[PDB]
Every structure is written in C-alpha cells, then in structure tokens.
C-alpha cells in the first residue's frame, strides 16, 4: 500500500498448547488451504523431537527457531545500475515468520519418507545447528556482513 | 459511446413497469413476442398521430393495454369503431380477446418520446437540425422541465464524417436513481443516413 | 456408437441396389452418397463408390469389414504434406 497502514487480523492460538507462533507456522506450512493435515504433520514433528530430545515440545520449537533466525537482512535499493543491496534491521514480528518459512523450505527440500518426519529432522538439525535453513540463515548474515558498509 | 440506459436502471425505482403481467416459463417467451408484435403494430399505425409508450397488462386471459398519447382527437378519432378495429387486430396477434385504455399525457413536451418524434419529423421534412434541437430545448424549458439533455449522432447535413451534437440545459441528473429521468431514443431515417436522437428530460426529485 | 438392441444403420435405397446387384450378378462400381451404412454379408463382393465430398471413391467390400461404416473408408478429408 501507498496510503494504508492497518492493524493486522487476530490469529487464534494452537489447540494443544496455546501458541500463536505454532498457528503461524502451521499456516506457513499449509497451501491450498489444507490446515488440518498440516497441523497434524506439525504435531507429529513435535512429538518425534520430544521423543528424541526429552524436553518440552514448545521450548524445543523456540530454541530451534532462535538458532535459524537472523538479526540483519539485505534489501535492494536499485538507485544505480550496480546492485545496492543494503542490510536493514529486522523487526521481531516478521523475523520469526521468515525463519518459519525457511524451515518449511528446508523440509520441502528434504528426502525423508514422511513429511512430518522430514520437518522433525529439520528441527533436530536446527537444534544442533547443521541443517539447510540454518545454512541459509548463515550466508544471509554473511551477505549482510559484507555489505553492512552501506547505510 | 458509454453509459447505462436510464429507463432500465429505474424500472423498479421511479419508473412504473411497461410490462405488467405474470406468465410461467412455459408461456413467457411467446407472450413477450406477442406483446412486441402488438407494440410494432401500434408504432406502424399511430406514427402520424402523436404517441409515446404503451403499458401492457393481462389478467384472467383478457388484456388491457394502456396507451400514452399526446392528442386523443386523432388517436381515438371521431368514433369508437376505429378503436374497436384496432383492438381486433391486437386480439388476433395475441390470441385472447383484447381491451384497451387510453391515456392523454399532460404537458406533451415534458415527455421525451413525443419530442424525439417531432425532432425526427423535422429532420425528415428538411429543417436546420441544430436550430430545431435548440427550439425543442427552449420549448421544454418554457413548459417547466427542470432539466433537458438532447443528443443527435452521425451524418448531419450530409457530411462525409459523423457529427455528434448535443445540448444540455438545467440539471440532468443521470446518476441520481431517485430522479425522474424520462429518456427516449428516436432514430431518423434521413436521405443522408441515420441520425440517432437521444433525449433525457428531468421532471422531478422524489 | 449405437446399442445392439436398437439396431445398426442400413439405408433402404442402397440395400435395394445391393439386392438388385445380387439378383443381377453384375456387381461393378455402385454410387453411394449415404456413408452411414453398416457392411453386410450380402454386400461382400460389391464395389461401392462412396461420396467423400468432391468425388466418389470406389472401395471394395471384404469379409474384414462387417462391423464398420462406409464413410470411414471414404477419406472425407484430404492431405499430402507441408
């Protein structure tokens, strides 16, 4: 929008735990509209992580996210012919979302036999900082670092 | 060329329905066609006599047609035999026995269709088109029209290019849905071509 | 495709012609506009010039033809190459 700045719609928390973040993650996972399948998958992923780690299902979710989220993000300015990809401070609201999206992408990329299992594995990787999403985050940070020069 | 036909947007608002009868899907289309035919016949017959529009109503399979005219002296005639004759043909066209009612329009220049017809006639007997239009508008204003827009299109004065020409006087609220916009079109069959005379007359705000 | 209960297509005129040919024993090319006709056991041996649009093309009736219509054998569309 050129003109409109509006307060965003209310999203209801997760049925099992009571988390908006979880709901957001599920939404991100879901396309075509199939939420209940996606939600189920997410639950399954959580379960396996709990079975592996021996920790709380939400807390583990949180630290994985922490491990995959960046503080600085590049953005193109397009003033000249050469690329002016300036790094900008990312707000805590959308940072989470971006991380979730990255996780989803990584899961999609992965080749484990169950989709729930795939994302569980991704989460595990994030926890031990070795997966695909984390790698992506790392180079994003590196890219920002290189061009942190600009303001 | 772009806009809504005003008589069709106001048909359930300010304009009363020109067609006022119920028929089943089985018996709708044919009835409509019959009505159209009757309208055509009327047009053929009473073009020399000043007529505007007709309202058709058929209860208990016995039609009453309401005719909106300017002058009843030629439309009815001297006697009600001509009327009877006219009815017969309508009956023949439709199927069931026919009855009619006549309505004299008060202020003939307030109604658009009659004015349009007059303009067409003027065009036919070769008069200055622009001037005629101006005269018409003036007459309307004299009569107490709150607004009048007239519009003629194409082949004016035998020009090789089409001429779009229009006069606007008073207030003609084409967009106000509660406005009584009386809109009609008469298309002139001139020697040089076809000139389409469009006329809106704003009567009142209700 | 028709139901077998309904009964496959035969044109009357052509049938009559076929019958005549059988009785006659002349056979030869026989003119046919109506291409909808189903091939019959009596028709085997008869050559029939089927209308394809501009011209009649004679196609010889065989035993490998029973469950077919005449106009299929008529190349109603023509093509050579680009």
């Amino acid at each position: 929008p050129r003109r409109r700045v509006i307060g965003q719609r209310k999203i209801l928390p997760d049925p099992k735990f009571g988390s908006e973040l979880l709901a957001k993650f599920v939404n991100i996972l879901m396309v075509d509209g199939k939420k209940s399948t996606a939600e189920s998958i997410v639950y399954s992923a959580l379960e396996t992580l709990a079975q592996r780690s021996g920790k709380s299902e939400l807390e583990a979710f949180e630290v994985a996210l922490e491990n995959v989220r960046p503080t600085v993000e590049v953005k193109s300015r397009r003033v000249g012919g050469s690329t002016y990809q300036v790094p900008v401070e990312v707000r805590p609201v959308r940072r989470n979302a971006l991380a979730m999206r990255w996780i989803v992408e990584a899961a999609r990329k992965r080749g484990d036999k169950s989709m729930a299992l795939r994302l569980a594995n991704e989460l595990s990787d994030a926890a031990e900082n070795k997966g695909t999403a984390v790698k992506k985050r790392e180079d994003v940070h590196r890219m920002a670092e290189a061009n942190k020069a600009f303001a | 060329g772009q806009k809504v036909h005003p008589n069709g947007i106001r048909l359930g608002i300010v304009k009363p329905w020109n067609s006022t009868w119920f028929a089943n899907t089985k018996e709708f289309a044919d009835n409509l066609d019959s009505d159209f035919k009757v309208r055509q016949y009327l047009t053929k017959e009473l073009a020399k006599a000043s007529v505007s529009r007709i309202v058709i109503e058929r209860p208990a399979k016995s039609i009453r047609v309401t005719i909106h005219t300017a002058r009843p002296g030629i439309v009815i005639g001297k006697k009600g035999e001509d009327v009877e004759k006219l009815r017969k043909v309508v009956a023949d066209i439709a199927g069931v026995p026919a009855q009619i009612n006549i309505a004299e329009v008060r202020k003939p220049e307030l109604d658009a269709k009659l004015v349009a017809d007059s303009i067409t006639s003027q065009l036919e007997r070769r008069v200055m088109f622009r001037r005629a239009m101006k005269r018409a508008v003036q007459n309307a204003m004299r009569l107490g029209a709150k607004g009048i827009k007239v519009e003629v299109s194409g082949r004016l004065g035998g020009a090789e290019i089409a001429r779009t020409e229009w006069y606007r006087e008073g207030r003609v609220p084409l967009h106000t849905l509660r406005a009584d916009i009386d809109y009609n079109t008469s298309e002139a069959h001139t020697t040089y071509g076809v000139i389409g005379v469009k006329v809106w007359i704003f009567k009142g705000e209700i | 495709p028709r139901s077998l209960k309904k009964g496959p297509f035969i044109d009357l005129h052509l049938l009559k012609k076929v019958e005549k040919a059988v009785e006659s024993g002349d056979k030869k090319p026989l003119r046919t506009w109506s291409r909808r006709s189903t091939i019959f056991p009596n028709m085997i041996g008869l050559t029939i010039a089927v209308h394809n649009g501009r011209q009649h093309v004679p196609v010889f009736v065989t035993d490998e033809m029973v469950g077919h219509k005449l106009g299929e054998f008529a190349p109603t569309r023509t093509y050579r190459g680009h």
Binding site: - | G12, F22, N24, E57, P59, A60 | -
Partner: protein, 98 residues
Amino acid sequence: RIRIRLKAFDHRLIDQATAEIVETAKRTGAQVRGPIPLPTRKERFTVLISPHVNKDARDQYEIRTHLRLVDIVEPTEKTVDALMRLDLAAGVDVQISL
C-alpha cells in the same frame, strides 16, 4: 382446505394484492392465516452487453419471482364465490388450489 398462491414480479404490488386478498377473505369468510412470503426465485440472467466481441462485458440481470401464500382451512359459500370474481389481481397470477 383452500390454498391460494399469489405470483408477481414486483414486490410492493404483490404485497398490496396480498393485503387486498386478506381483506376480501376477512369480510366474507372466517379464520384466514394471513400473508407468508416464500423465498424469492431469483432468475439470474447474464447477458453479453456487446453484440460483437467483448467477453469481459456482461450485463447481469435478475427476475424476482415473488411468492405469497394466504392459507384458509375453512370453506364458506359466500367467500369462495367472491374470490374467483372478486380479487382485483391486475398483474398478479393467482392460483387457487381448492
């Protein structure tokens, strides 16, 4: 006993006619269960506005088929007679199921 159904294209007119019917019923006969409007049969008719070309342009029209039922489960000789001739429906198709 007697189901009278009222069918018209205009709503106000139909309402008026219904009221008239009710009035007719009340004076001559007995009981009457008044007007019950049934769902409007909306005849969605989409017309291409342009004669040649232009797919995007469509005039969207609707026929409002208004239904009105007045229900009486009591026959009187006075009122049955003064209903077939005393109705004044004008532009409303009245179907009297006796």
